[PDB]
Amino acid sequence: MKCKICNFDTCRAGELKVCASGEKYCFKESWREARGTRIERGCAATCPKGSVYGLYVLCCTTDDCN
């Protein structure tokens, strides 16, 4: 149960690790700004959203998405 972490549109990390051990999953989001968006990764159990800014949120589990 591992998860590959990388920045879309600029895969500069591409580092995979472990986290999905039971009640945990990977969370991938994208914060907006005005001259370029920033995709953030990390594995946990909280998948918050956005609106006042316009960030993207996407969680995953099982095979990589773990």
Curated annotation (Swiss-Prot):
Coiled coil: none annotated. Transmembrane segments: none annotated. The keyword Disulfide bond applies. The keyword Disulfide bond applies. Binds and inhibits muscular and neuronal nicotinic acetylcholine receptors (nAChR). Is a reversible antagonist of muscle nAChR (alpha-1-beta-1-delta-epsilon/CHRNA1-CHRNB1-CHRND-CHRNE) (IC(50)=10 nM) and a potent and poorly reversible antagonist of the neuronal alpha-7/CHRNA7 nAChR (IC(50)=50 nM). May exhibit differential affinities for the two binding sites on the muscle nAChR. One of its GO terms (molecular function) is acetylcholine receptor inhibitor activity. Belongs to the three-finger toxin family. Ancestral subfamily. Orphan group IV sub-subfamily. Disulfide bonds join 3-26, 6-11, 19-43, 47-59, 60-65. Expressed by the venom gland. It is found in: Secreted. This is Candoxin. Keywords: Acetylcholine receptor inhibiting toxin, Disulfide bond, Ion channel impairing toxin, Neurotoxin, Postsynaptic neurotoxin, Secreted, Signal, Toxin. It comes from Bungarus candidus. GO terms for cellular component: extracellular region. The chain holds residues 22 to 87 of 87 of the full protein.
